[PDB]
Amino acid sequence: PEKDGCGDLDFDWLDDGWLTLLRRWLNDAQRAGVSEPNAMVLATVADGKPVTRSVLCKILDESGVAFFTSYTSAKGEQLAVTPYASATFPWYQLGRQAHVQGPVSKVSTEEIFTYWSMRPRGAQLGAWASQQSRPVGSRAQLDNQLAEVTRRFADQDQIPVPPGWGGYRIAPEIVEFWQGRENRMHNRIRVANGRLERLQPGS
Amino acid sequence: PEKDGCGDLDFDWLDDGWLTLLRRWLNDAQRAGVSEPNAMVLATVADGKPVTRSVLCKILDESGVAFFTSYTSAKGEQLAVTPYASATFPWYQLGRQAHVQGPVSKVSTEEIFTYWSMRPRGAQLGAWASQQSRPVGSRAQLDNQLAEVTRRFADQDQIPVPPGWGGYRIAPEIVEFWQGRENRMHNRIRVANGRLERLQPGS
């Protein structure tokens, strides 16, 4: 009970729909000092087996949750074969989690440009520096990669989008809010087809 | 490079094997005040589609990472059909991640007893109060479930293991260490067939 300082998560918390509540939860985490409050752990499937890693949620609206990545990465390939994902926001400090699962689609060239342009150039370089799946043996080699990319763009103030870099967006088909409680009787609300369902703590 | 106070993770950080490094990283997460240092996001598969939620890693050894849960949860059913998982320790505050993927076996009845007994009275009751199927319409109902189970065991000093309750272990067939860097030239070392491998940041 203590952890988020709040009373029980219940149906009425969803009165303004799933989006308002997620946006509020994401803001409580930001405000409470959580590091990377917008990071989520994304699961995809590779040859029938699940694979997990962390990505940064950059857009949240009625169409779902979006993040940015190289199309050439393993996440990209896996999502190309099996375009469904699940993501979890792990807000342990507050005893909270939210999960989103659904079909994945690419974001617009439009949107890619915008979020690419807000990117601090320290990172713009970094993106370009990552030599998509090129063999690497040392760390020095990584350094050379970033030096080489840095020179190449030194006289450019408007670094362009790499040829295979864009985003993906998970549709909010199933969204679950999880509020933990000291006496293990966790509050679990699942949203699906505009219907709401309360789940037993142990699933 | 800031976030864990450290230089680059490299092959020499693996000299005494993945187990020892995962243990060091878990411990660093503790010393730093990270909430739920041992929690991990577990992905499973449900009819070819990934599914995520957090579990607590309670055993870390040579045979892999283990957590405890009701066999009758969605996660248990999913692991029964497709006994492979991936898990991620999201240490965002230190800019670190560890991933572990592999086949999944049940823990023994021996170890279930041992870890069950280490739970405080509150958590054992909590676990017994989660009634596997039974739909839930109100939150007051969870309360009465905890109150039935409290009264039912009022005279038992030592509460028994619930009938459906046990553990799962992920074998360390792939282990990745991820250490973020301000310049985006993240360090990534994957472990597989005792062979080490540096990966390009952008996967």
Side-chain angles (χ1 to χ4, degrees), chain A residues 3 35-36 45 52 54 74 86 88 92-93 97 126 129-131 134 136-137 139 145 185 187 200 202-203, chain B residues 3 8 11 35-36 50 52 54 74 86 88 92-93 97 129-131 134 136 139 145 185 187 200 202-203:
Chain A
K3 257 178 186 222
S35 334
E36 315 283 3
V45 186
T52 54
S54 290
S86 162
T88 280
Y92 309 138
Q93 188 184 319
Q97 285 178 278
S130 196
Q131 239 141 245
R134 139 142 117 124
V136 208
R139 159 81 244 196
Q145 287 188 203
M185 289 285 183
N187 287 118
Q200 291 281 166
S203 149
Chain B
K3 286 219 223 185
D8 308 307
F11 301 122
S35 322
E36 314 277 21
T52 53
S54 315
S86 153
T88 290
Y92 307 140
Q93 180 201 322
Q97 295 173 265
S130 188
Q131 296 174 203
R134 182 173 196 190
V136 212
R139 157 74 237 190
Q145 280 181 195
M185 296 297 91
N187 298 132
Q200 290 279 152
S203 139

mmCIF file of all heavy atoms in Angstrom, chain A residues 3 35-36 45 52 54 74 86 88 92-93 97 126 129-131 134 136-137 139 145 185 187 200 202-203, chain B residues 3 8 11 35-36 50 52 54 74 86 88 92-93 97 129-131 134 136 139 145 185 187 200 202-203:
data_model
loop_
_atom_site.group_PDB
_atom_site.id
_atom_site.type_symbol
_atom_site.label_atom_id
_atom_site.label_comp_id
_atom_site.label_asym_id
_atom_site.label_seq_id
_atom_site.Cartn_x
_atom_site.Cartn_y
_atom_site.Cartn_z
ATOM 1 N N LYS A 3 3.724 2.023 -1.172
ATOM 2 C CA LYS A 3 4.752 2.346 -2.202
ATOM 3 C C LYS A 3 4.491 3.486 -3.194
ATOM 4 O O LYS A 3 5.392 4.300 -3.469
ATOM 5 C CB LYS A 3 5.236 1.125 -2.946
ATOM 6 C CG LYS A 3 6.588 0.664 -2.476
ATOM 7 C CD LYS A 3 7.009 -0.597 -3.221
ATOM 8 C CE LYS A 3 8.309 -1.179 -2.674
ATOM 9 N NZ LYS A 3 9.180 -1.631 -3.824
ATOM 10 N N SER A 35 14.599 6.866 -12.700
ATOM 11 C CA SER A 35 15.472 6.982 -13.917
ATOM 12 C C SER A 35 14.826 6.362 -15.158
ATOM 13 O O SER A 35 14.179 5.327 -15.055
ATOM 14 C CB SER A 35 16.848 6.325 -13.756
ATOM 15 O OG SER A 35 17.225 6.287 -12.404
ATOM 16 N N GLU A 36 15.026 6.996 -16.319
ATOM 17 C CA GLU A 36 14.369 6.562 -17.563
ATOM 18 C C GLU A 36 12.906 6.145 -17.375
ATOM 19 O O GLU A 36 12.565 5.020 -17.662
ATOM 20 C CB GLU A 36 15.168 5.405 -18.179
ATOM 21 C CG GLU A 36 16.682 5.682 -18.159
ATOM 22 C CD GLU A 36 17.108 6.662 -19.261
ATOM 23 O OE1 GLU A 36 16.239 7.184 -20.028
ATOM 24 O OE2 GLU A 36 18.341 6.855 -19.412
ATOM 25 N N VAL A 45 9.531 -12.083 -30.753
ATOM 26 C CA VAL A 45 9.639 -13.494 -30.934
ATOM 27 C C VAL A 45 10.682 -13.770 -32.039
ATOM 28 O O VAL A 45 10.675 -13.133 -33.104
ATOM 29 C CB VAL A 45 8.276 -14.048 -31.360
ATOM 30 C CG1 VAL A 45 8.315 -15.506 -31.409
ATOM 31 C CG2 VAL A 45 7.233 -13.675 -30.372
ATOM 32 N N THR A 52 13.799 -10.437 -25.145
ATOM 33 C CA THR A 52 13.486 -9.169 -24.445
ATOM 34 C C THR A 52 14.643 -8.181 -24.485
ATOM 35 O O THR A 52 15.795 -8.582 -24.353
ATOM 36 C CB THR A 52 13.270 -9.346 -22.912
ATOM 37 O OG1 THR A 52 14.408 -10.003 -22.382
ATOM 38 C CG2 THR A 52 12.007 -10.120 -22.533
ATOM 39 N N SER A 54 15.459 -3.507 -23.619
ATOM 40 C CA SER A 54 14.819 -2.246 -23.236
ATOM 41 C C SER A 54 14.835 -1.285 -24.379
ATOM 42 O O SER A 54 15.807 -1.257 -25.129
ATOM 43 C CB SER A 54 15.490 -1.627 -22.030
ATOM 44 O OG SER A 54 15.253 -2.369 -20.824
ATOM 45 N N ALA A 74 18.283 -6.826 -34.678
ATOM 46 C CA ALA A 74 17.492 -8.046 -34.463
ATOM 47 C C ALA A 74 15.999 -7.777 -34.132
ATOM 48 O O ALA A 74 15.147 -8.482 -34.645
ATOM 49 C CB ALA A 74 18.148 -8.948 -33.431
ATOM 50 N N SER A 86 4.975 -7.353 -27.049
ATOM 51 C CA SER A 86 4.540 -6.878 -25.736
ATOM 52 C C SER A 86 5.639 -6.007 -25.105
ATOM 53 O O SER A 86 6.839 -6.286 -25.281
ATOM 54 C CB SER A 86 4.142 -8.059 -24.822
ATOM 55 O OG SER A 86 4.114 -7.665 -23.436
ATOM 56 N N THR A 88 6.534 -3.799 -21.233
ATOM 57 C CA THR A 88 6.252 -3.554 -19.825
ATOM 58 C C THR A 88 7.059 -2.335 -19.320
ATOM 59 O O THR A 88 8.283 -2.256 -19.579
ATOM 60 C CB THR A 88 6.687 -4.781 -18.947
ATOM 61 O OG1 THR A 88 5.689 -5.826 -19.007
ATOM 62 C CG2 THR A 88 6.888 -4.372 -17.520
ATOM 63 N N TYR A 92 9.342 -0.078 -10.431
ATOM 64 C CA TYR A 92 9.492 -0.748 -9.138
ATOM 65 C C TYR A 92 9.449 0.254 -7.969
ATOM 66 O O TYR A 92 8.758 0.008 -6.963
ATOM 67 C CB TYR A 92 10.752 -1.732 -9.126
ATOM 68 C CG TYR A 92 10.830 -2.724 -10.278
ATOM 69 C CD1 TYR A 92 12.060 -3.002 -10.947
ATOM 70 C CD2 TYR A 92 9.647 -3.360 -10.745
ATOM 71 C CE1 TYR A 92 12.092 -3.889 -12.067
ATOM 72 C CE2 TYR A 92 9.656 -4.239 -11.843
ATOM 73 C CZ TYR A 92 10.853 -4.505 -12.478
ATOM 74 O OH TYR A 92 10.749 -5.371 -13.513
ATOM 75 N N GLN A 93 10.127 1.409 -8.100
ATOM 76 C CA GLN A 93 10.144 2.354 -6.991
ATOM 77 C C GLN A 93 8.731 2.678 -6.446
ATOM 78 O O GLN A 93 8.579 2.968 -5.256
ATOM 79 C CB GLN A 93 10.854 3.611 -7.398
ATOM 80 C CG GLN A 93 11.108 4.624 -6.270
ATOM 81 C CD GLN A 93 11.742 5.910 -6.826
ATOM 82 O OE1 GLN A 93 12.628 5.867 -7.705
ATOM 83 N NE2 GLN A 93 11.271 7.044 -6.353
ATOM 84 N N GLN A 97 3.440 -1.313 -12.524
ATOM 85 C CA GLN A 97 3.836 -1.796 -13.842
ATOM 86 C C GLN A 97 2.654 -1.510 -14.750
ATOM 87 O O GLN A 97 1.506 -1.566 -14.302
ATOM 88 C CB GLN A 97 3.994 -3.310 -13.836
ATOM 89 C CG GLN A 97 5.183 -3.878 -13.202
ATOM 90 C CD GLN A 97 5.145 -5.398 -13.263
ATOM 91 O OE1 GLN A 97 4.495 -6.061 -12.428
ATOM 92 N NE2 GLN A 97 5.830 -5.964 -14.242
ATOM 93 N N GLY A 126 26.023 8.999 -32.800
ATOM 94 C CA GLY A 126 26.009 7.671 -32.160
ATOM 95 C C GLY A 126 25.218 6.664 -32.995
ATOM 96 O O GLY A 126 25.657 5.529 -33.219
ATOM 97 N N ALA A 129 27.067 5.860 -36.080
ATOM 98 C CA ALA A 129 28.332 5.219 -35.681
ATOM 99 C C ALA A 129 28.139 3.704 -35.577
ATOM 100 O O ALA A 129 29.035 2.922 -35.918
ATOM 101 C CB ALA A 129 28.791 5.759 -34.328
ATOM 102 N N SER A 130 26.959 3.325 -35.098
ATOM 103 C CA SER A 130 26.594 1.912 -34.950
ATOM 104 C C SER A 130 26.534 1.301 -36.337
ATOM 105 O O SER A 130 25.611 1.579 -37.120
ATOM 106 C CB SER A 130 25.235 1.775 -34.268
ATOM 107 O OG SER A 130 25.052 0.442 -33.806
ATOM 108 N N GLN A 131 27.523 0.484 -36.615
ATOM 109 C CA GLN A 131 27.637 -0.149 -37.916
ATOM 110 C C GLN A 131 26.913 -1.439 -37.978
ATOM 111 O O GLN A 131 27.525 -2.514 -38.092
ATOM 112 C CB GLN A 131 29.044 -0.430 -38.271
ATOM 113 C CG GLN A 131 29.424 0.264 -39.550
ATOM 114 C CD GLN A 131 30.823 0.802 -39.491
ATOM 115 O OE1 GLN A 131 31.008 2.014 -39.526
ATOM 116 N NE2 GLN A 131 31.824 -0.042 -39.400
ATOM 117 N N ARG A 134 28.079 -5.274 -38.085
ATOM 118 C CA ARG A 134 29.451 -5.387 -38.738
ATOM 119 C C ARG A 134 30.332 -6.075 -37.693
ATOM 120 O O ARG A 134 30.322 -5.713 -36.512
ATOM 121 C CB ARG A 134 30.079 -4.000 -39.119
ATOM 122 C CG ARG A 134 31.621 -3.915 -38.818
ATOM 123 C CD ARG A 134 32.463 -3.130 -39.874
ATOM 124 N NE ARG A 134 33.116 -1.901 -39.326
ATOM 125 C CZ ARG A 134 34.456 -1.627 -39.366
ATOM 126 N NH1 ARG A 134 35.337 -2.475 -39.924
ATOM 127 N NH2 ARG A 134 35.015 -0.509 -38.866
ATOM 128 N N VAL A 136 32.830 -6.959 -34.864
ATOM 129 C CA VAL A 136 33.609 -6.113 -33.926
ATOM 130 C C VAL A 136 34.368 -6.992 -32.916
ATOM 131 O O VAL A 136 33.761 -7.776 -32.163
ATOM 132 C CB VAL A 136 32.682 -5.173 -33.142
ATOM 133 C CG1 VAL A 136 33.371 -3.876 -32.712
ATOM 134 C CG2 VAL A 136 31.451 -4.740 -33.938
ATOM 135 N N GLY A 137 35.680 -6.667 -32.613
ATOM 136 C CA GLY A 137 36.524 -7.440 -31.680
ATOM 137 C C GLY A 137 37.005 -6.603 -30.508
ATOM 138 O O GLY A 137 37.382 -7.115 -29.439
ATOM 139 N N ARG A 139 36.901 -2.670 -28.583
ATOM 140 C CA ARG A 139 36.279 -1.517 -28.185
ATOM 141 C C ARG A 139 36.959 -0.316 -28.852
ATOM 142 O O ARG A 139 36.360 0.747 -29.057
ATOM 143 C CB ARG A 139 36.411 -1.598 -26.697
ATOM 144 C CG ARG A 139 36.291 -0.315 -26.002
ATOM 145 C CD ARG A 139 34.859 0.090 -25.818
ATOM 146 N NE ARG A 139 34.569 1.308 -26.538
ATOM 147 C CZ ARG A 139 33.512 2.066 -26.331
ATOM 148 N NH1 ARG A 139 32.597 1.737 -25.405
ATOM 149 N NH2 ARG A 139 33.281 3.185 -27.012
ATOM 150 N N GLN A 145 34.979 3.982 -35.212
ATOM 151 C CA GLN A 145 33.704 4.089 -35.923
ATOM 152 C C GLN A 145 33.086 5.475 -35.671
ATOM 153 O O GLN A 145 32.680 6.177 -36.610
ATOM 154 C CB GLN A 145 32.753 2.989 -35.450
ATOM 155 C CG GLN A 145 33.161 1.609 -35.977
ATOM 156 C CD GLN A 145 32.135 0.517 -35.684
ATOM 157 O OE1 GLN A 145 32.488 -0.659 -35.651
ATOM 158 N NE2 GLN A 145 30.873 0.836 -35.466
ATOM 159 N N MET A 185 -1.730 -8.809 -2.241
ATOM 160 C CA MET A 185 -3.008 -8.791 -2.947
ATOM 161 C C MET A 185 -3.009 -7.574 -3.887
ATOM 162 O O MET A 185 -3.679 -6.573 -3.671
ATOM 163 C CB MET A 185 -4.128 -8.636 -1.905
ATOM 164 C CG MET A 185 -4.290 -9.909 -1.081
ATOM 165 S SD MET A 185 -5.115 -11.232 -1.996
ATOM 166 C CE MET A 185 -5.357 -12.645 -0.944
ATOM 167 N N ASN A 187 -3.403 -5.172 -7.156
ATOM 168 C CA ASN A 187 -4.533 -4.647 -7.950
ATOM 169 C C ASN A 187 -4.150 -4.619 -9.427
ATOM 170 O O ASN A 187 -3.168 -3.962 -9.819
ATOM 171 C CB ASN A 187 -4.881 -3.220 -7.522
ATOM 172 C CG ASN A 187 -5.573 -3.145 -6.162
ATOM 173 O OD1 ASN A 187 -5.039 -2.534 -5.242
ATOM 174 N ND2 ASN A 187 -6.739 -3.734 -5.980
ATOM 175 N N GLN A 200 -7.116 -11.915 -10.612
ATOM 176 C CA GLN A 200 -6.540 -12.426 -9.358
ATOM 177 C C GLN A 200 -5.035 -12.076 -9.281
ATOM 178 O O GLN A 200 -4.317 -12.227 -10.264
ATOM 179 C CB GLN A 200 -6.725 -13.942 -9.260
ATOM 180 C CG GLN A 200 -8.155 -14.375 -9.078
ATOM 181 C CD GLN A 200 -8.638 -14.220 -7.642
ATOM 182 O OE1 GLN A 200 -9.856 -14.275 -7.365
ATOM 183 N NE2 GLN A 200 -7.686 -14.018 -6.709
ATOM 184 N N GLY A 202 -2.261 -13.443 -8.332
ATOM 185 C CA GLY A 202 -1.400 -14.491 -8.868
ATOM 186 C C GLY A 202 -1.875 -14.963 -10.236
ATOM 187 O O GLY A 202 -1.764 -16.125 -10.586
ATOM 188 N N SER A 203 -2.404 -14.005 -10.992
ATOM 189 C CA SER A 203 -2.627 -14.021 -12.464
ATOM 190 C C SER A 203 -4.029 -14.457 -12.670
ATOM 191 O O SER A 203 -4.309 -15.555 -12.250
ATOM 192 C CB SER A 203 -1.649 -14.845 -13.299
ATOM 193 O OG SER A 203 -2.336 -15.334 -14.439
ATOM 194 N N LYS B 3 26.996 6.898 -15.934
ATOM 195 C CA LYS B 3 25.930 6.382 -15.032
ATOM 196 C C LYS B 3 26.321 5.253 -14.032
ATOM 197 O O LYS B 3 25.728 5.322 -12.923
ATOM 198 C CB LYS B 3 24.687 5.899 -15.844
ATOM 199 C CG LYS B 3 23.862 7.109 -16.413
ATOM 200 C CD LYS B 3 22.395 6.756 -16.276
ATOM 201 C CE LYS B 3 21.514 7.106 -17.517
ATOM 202 N NZ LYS B 3 20.040 6.804 -17.172
ATOM 203 N N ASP B 8 34.485 1.024 -19.582
ATOM 204 C CA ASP B 8 33.841 0.082 -20.508
ATOM 205 C C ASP B 8 33.911 -1.358 -20.117
ATOM 206 O O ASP B 8 34.968 -1.897 -19.761
ATOM 207 C CB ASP B 8 34.504 0.136 -21.862
ATOM 208 C CG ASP B 8 34.601 1.542 -22.381
ATOM 209 O OD1 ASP B 8 33.539 2.266 -22.425
ATOM 210 O OD2 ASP B 8 35.736 2.007 -22.760
ATOM 211 N N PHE B 11 35.706 -7.856 -22.557
ATOM 212 C CA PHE B 11 35.899 -9.323 -22.364
ATOM 213 C C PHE B 11 36.590 -9.613 -21.031
ATOM 214 O O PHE B 11 36.360 -10.670 -20.415
ATOM 215 C CB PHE B 11 36.764 -9.933 -23.459
ATOM 216 C CG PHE B 11 36.189 -9.743 -24.856
ATOM 217 C CD1 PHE B 11 36.953 -9.091 -25.825
ATOM 218 C CD2 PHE B 11 34.906 -10.221 -25.167
ATOM 219 C CE1 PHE B 11 36.438 -8.910 -27.113
ATOM 220 C CE2 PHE B 11 34.391 -10.038 -26.460
ATOM 221 C CZ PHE B 11 35.158 -9.382 -27.431
ATOM 222 N N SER B 35 15.577 0.151 -6.540
ATOM 223 C CA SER B 35 14.422 -0.557 -6.001
ATOM 224 C C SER B 35 14.325 -1.886 -6.706
ATOM 225 O O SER B 35 14.442 -2.001 -7.950
ATOM 226 C CB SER B 35 13.094 0.159 -6.294
ATOM 227 O OG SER B 35 13.182 1.559 -6.204
ATOM 228 N N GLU B 36 14.035 -2.953 -5.945
ATOM 229 C CA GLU B 36 13.903 -4.314 -6.443
ATOM 230 C C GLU B 36 15.052 -4.695 -7.328
ATOM 231 O O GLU B 36 14.829 -5.115 -8.460
ATOM 232 C CB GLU B 36 12.621 -4.478 -7.220
ATOM 233 C CG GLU B 36 11.443 -3.879 -6.527
ATOM 234 C CD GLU B 36 10.859 -4.782 -5.489
ATOM 235 O OE1 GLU B 36 11.534 -5.716 -4.985
ATOM 236 O OE2 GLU B 36 9.684 -4.541 -5.174
ATOM 237 N N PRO B 50 4.408 -12.765 -28.040
ATOM 238 C CA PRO B 50 5.096 -12.483 -26.771
ATOM 239 C C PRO B 50 4.159 -11.892 -25.720
ATOM 240 O O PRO B 50 3.149 -11.221 -26.094
ATOM 241 C CB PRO B 50 6.147 -11.459 -27.139
ATOM 242 C CG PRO B 50 6.011 -11.163 -28.632
ATOM 243 C CD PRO B 50 4.893 -11.987 -29.190
ATOM 244 N N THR B 52 4.688 -10.084 -21.504
ATOM 245 C CA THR B 52 5.694 -9.650 -20.510
ATOM 246 C C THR B 52 5.086 -9.326 -19.155
ATOM 247 O O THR B 52 3.950 -8.804 -19.065
ATOM 248 C CB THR B 52 6.467 -8.323 -20.938
ATOM 249 O OG1 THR B 52 5.538 -7.268 -21.269
ATOM 250 C CG2 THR B 52 7.388 -8.565 -22.120
ATOM 251 N N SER B 54 6.820 -8.696 -14.754
ATOM 252 C CA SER B 54 7.967 -8.848 -13.863
ATOM 253 C C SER B 54 7.756 -10.008 -12.883
ATOM 254 O O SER B 54 6.621 -10.291 -12.447
ATOM 255 C CB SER B 54 8.247 -7.559 -13.097
ATOM 256 O OG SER B 54 8.194 -6.414 -13.964
ATOM 257 N N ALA B 74 -1.433 -17.594 -16.057
ATOM 258 C CA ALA B 74 -1.140 -17.504 -17.496
ATOM 259 C C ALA B 74 0.345 -17.852 -17.825
ATOM 260 O O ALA B 74 0.622 -18.644 -18.770
ATOM 261 C CB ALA B 74 -1.538 -16.114 -18.062
ATOM 262 N N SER B 86 12.792 -15.493 -22.126
ATOM 263 C CA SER B 86 13.898 -14.538 -22.000
ATOM 264 C C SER B 86 13.560 -13.599 -20.848
ATOM 265 O O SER B 86 12.374 -13.359 -20.639
ATOM 266 C CB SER B 86 14.122 -13.786 -23.332
ATOM 267 O OG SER B 86 14.695 -12.513 -23.148
ATOM 268 N N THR B 88 14.970 -9.819 -18.529
ATOM 269 C CA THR B 88 15.853 -8.671 -18.488
ATOM 270 C C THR B 88 15.827 -7.990 -17.101
ATOM 271 O O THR B 88 14.764 -7.648 -16.575
ATOM 272 C CB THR B 88 15.457 -7.684 -19.607
ATOM 273 O OG1 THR B 88 15.798 -8.264 -20.874
ATOM 274 C CG2 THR B 88 16.146 -6.337 -19.454
ATOM 275 N N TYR B 92 18.063 0.712 -14.937
ATOM 276 C CA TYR B 92 18.207 2.010 -15.659
ATOM 277 C C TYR B 92 19.096 3.058 -14.986
ATOM 278 O O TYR B 92 19.949 3.731 -15.655
ATOM 279 C CB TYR B 92 16.858 2.606 -16.054
ATOM 280 C CG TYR B 92 15.953 1.670 -16.836
ATOM 281 C CD1 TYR B 92 14.568 1.615 -16.593
ATOM 282 C CD2 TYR B 92 16.490 0.820 -17.811
ATOM 283 C CE1 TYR B 92 13.746 0.723 -17.334
ATOM 284 C CE2 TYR B 92 15.701 -0.043 -18.537
ATOM 285 C CZ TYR B 92 14.338 -0.094 -18.316
ATOM 286 O OH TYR B 92 13.591 -0.960 -19.102
ATOM 287 N N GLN B 93 18.933 3.171 -13.667
ATOM 288 C CA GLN B 93 19.728 4.149 -12.798
ATOM 289 C C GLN B 93 21.259 3.961 -12.938
ATOM 290 O O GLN B 93 22.019 4.891 -12.737
ATOM 291 C CB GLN B 93 19.263 4.040 -11.342
ATOM 292 C CG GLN B 93 19.940 4.951 -10.334
ATOM 293 C CD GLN B 93 19.778 4.400 -8.912
ATOM 294 O OE1 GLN B 93 18.710 3.850 -8.554
ATOM 295 N NE2 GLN B 93 20.844 4.494 -8.107
ATOM 296 N N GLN B 97 21.868 -3.275 -18.304
ATOM 297 C CA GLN B 97 20.874 -4.335 -18.445
ATOM 298 C C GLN B 97 21.575 -5.687 -18.463
ATOM 299 O O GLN B 97 22.738 -5.813 -18.962
ATOM 300 C CB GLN B 97 20.122 -4.175 -19.750
ATOM 301 C CG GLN B 97 19.289 -2.931 -19.861
ATOM 302 C CD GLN B 97 18.719 -2.792 -21.253
ATOM 303 O OE1 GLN B 97 19.297 -2.113 -22.112
ATOM 304 N NE2 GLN B 97 17.619 -3.473 -21.507
ATOM 305 N N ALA B 129 -4.146 -16.564 -0.688
ATOM 306 C CA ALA B 129 -5.373 -15.752 -0.925
ATOM 307 C C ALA B 129 -5.694 -15.581 -2.424
ATOM 308 O O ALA B 129 -6.833 -15.282 -2.809
ATOM 309 C CB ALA B 129 -5.225 -14.356 -0.325
ATOM 310 N N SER B 130 -4.697 -15.766 -3.267
ATOM 311 C CA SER B 130 -4.892 -15.653 -4.730
ATOM 312 C C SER B 130 -5.496 -16.962 -5.229
ATOM 313 O O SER B 130 -4.802 -17.971 -5.368
ATOM 314 C CB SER B 130 -3.561 -15.399 -5.436
ATOM 315 O OG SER B 130 -3.790 -15.107 -6.812
ATOM 316 N N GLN B 131 -6.782 -16.886 -5.500
ATOM 317 C CA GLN B 131 -7.555 -18.050 -5.918
ATOM 318 C C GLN B 131 -7.623 -18.120 -7.433
ATOM 319 O O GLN B 131 -8.486 -17.449 -8.065
ATOM 320 C CB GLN B 131 -8.926 -17.986 -5.307
ATOM 321 C CG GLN B 131 -8.835 -18.087 -3.785
ATOM 322 C CD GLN B 131 -10.161 -17.885 -3.075
ATOM 323 O OE1 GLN B 131 -10.171 -17.528 -1.900
ATOM 324 N NE2 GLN B 131 -11.292 -18.092 -3.723
ATOM 325 N N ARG B 134 -11.410 -18.473 -10.066
ATOM 326 C CA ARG B 134 -12.485 -17.602 -9.525
ATOM 327 C C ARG B 134 -12.463 -16.159 -10.096
ATOM 328 O O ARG B 134 -11.545 -15.371 -9.826
ATOM 329 C CB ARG B 134 -12.322 -17.477 -8.017
ATOM 330 C CG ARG B 134 -13.413 -16.651 -7.357
ATOM 331 C CD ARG B 134 -13.317 -16.689 -5.835
ATOM 332 N NE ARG B 134 -14.530 -16.220 -5.165
ATOM 333 C CZ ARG B 134 -14.601 -15.990 -3.853
ATOM 334 N NH1 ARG B 134 -13.531 -16.179 -3.063
ATOM 335 N NH2 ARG B 134 -15.704 -15.559 -3.228
ATOM 336 N N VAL B 136 -13.252 -12.151 -10.442
ATOM 337 C CA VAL B 136 -13.331 -11.098 -9.391
ATOM 338 C C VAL B 136 -14.113 -9.888 -9.908
ATOM 339 O O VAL B 136 -13.786 -9.318 -10.960
ATOM 340 C CB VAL B 136 -11.931 -10.620 -8.978
ATOM 341 C CG1 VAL B 136 -11.851 -10.192 -7.505
ATOM 342 C CG2 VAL B 136 -10.849 -11.687 -9.149
ATOM 343 N N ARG B 139 -13.056 -5.287 -5.418
ATOM 344 C CA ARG B 139 -11.839 -5.223 -4.646
ATOM 345 C C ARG B 139 -12.104 -5.675 -3.196
ATOM 346 O O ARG B 139 -11.206 -6.164 -2.486
ATOM 347 C CB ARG B 139 -11.381 -3.784 -4.741
ATOM 348 C CG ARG B 139 -10.489 -3.344 -3.622
ATOM 349 C CD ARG B 139 -9.089 -3.904 -3.737
ATOM 350 N NE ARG B 139 -8.719 -4.647 -2.546
ATOM 351 C CZ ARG B 139 -7.500 -5.091 -2.284
ATOM 352 N NH1 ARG B 139 -6.489 -4.876 -3.136
ATOM 353 N NH2 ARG B 139 -7.194 -5.770 -1.175
ATOM 354 N N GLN B 145 -11.134 -12.574 0.694
ATOM 355 C CA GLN B 145 -10.317 -13.832 0.313
ATOM 356 C C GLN B 145 -9.128 -13.928 1.275
ATOM 357 O O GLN B 145 -8.796 -15.007 1.788
ATOM 358 C CB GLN B 145 -9.780 -13.745 -1.116
ATOM 359 C CG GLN B 145 -10.819 -14.088 -2.184
ATOM 360 C CD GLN B 145 -10.248 -14.021 -3.606
ATOM 361 O OE1 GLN B 145 -11.003 -14.005 -4.577
ATOM 362 N NE2 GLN B 145 -8.937 -13.982 -3.785
ATOM 363 N N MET B 185 27.703 4.759 -27.780
ATOM 364 C CA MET B 185 28.553 3.635 -28.209
ATOM 365 C C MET B 185 28.574 2.578 -27.097
ATOM 366 O O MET B 185 29.639 2.225 -26.568
ATOM 367 C CB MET B 185 29.968 4.147 -28.482
ATOM 368 C CG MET B 185 30.019 5.144 -29.649
ATOM 369 S SD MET B 185 29.533 4.420 -31.204
ATOM 370 C CE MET B 185 27.783 4.626 -31.457
ATOM 371 N N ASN B 187 28.298 -0.709 -24.850
ATOM 372 C CA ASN B 187 29.080 -1.935 -24.758
ATOM 373 C C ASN B 187 28.128 -3.098 -24.563
ATOM 374 O O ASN B 187 27.235 -3.062 -23.709
ATOM 375 C CB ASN B 187 30.034 -1.811 -23.582
ATOM 376 C CG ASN B 187 31.005 -0.659 -23.784
ATOM 377 O OD1 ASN B 187 31.195 0.152 -22.883
ATOM 378 N ND2 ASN B 187 31.638 -0.538 -24.936
ATOM 379 N N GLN B 200 27.636 -4.786 -31.938
ATOM 380 C CA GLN B 200 27.417 -3.404 -32.337
ATOM 381 C C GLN B 200 26.313 -2.810 -31.467
ATOM 382 O O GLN B 200 25.315 -3.467 -31.220
ATOM 383 C CB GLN B 200 27.004 -3.344 -33.821
ATOM 384 C CG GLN B 200 28.104 -3.689 -34.818
ATOM 385 C CD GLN B 200 29.059 -2.501 -35.088
ATOM 386 O OE1 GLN B 200 30.252 -2.685 -35.424
ATOM 387 N NE2 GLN B 200 28.525 -1.279 -34.960
ATOM 388 N N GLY B 202 23.854 -0.776 -31.920
ATOM 389 C CA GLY B 202 22.533 -0.679 -32.555
ATOM 390 C C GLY B 202 22.074 -2.067 -32.864
ATOM 391 O O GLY B 202 21.388 -2.347 -33.852
ATOM 392 N N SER B 203 22.435 -2.930 -31.922
ATOM 393 C CA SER B 203 22.212 -4.394 -31.967
ATOM 394 C C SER B 203 23.136 -4.887 -33.074
ATOM 395 O O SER B 203 23.108 -4.328 -34.160
ATOM 396 C CB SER B 203 20.737 -4.800 -32.142
ATOM 397 O OG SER B 203 20.667 -5.878 -33.041
#
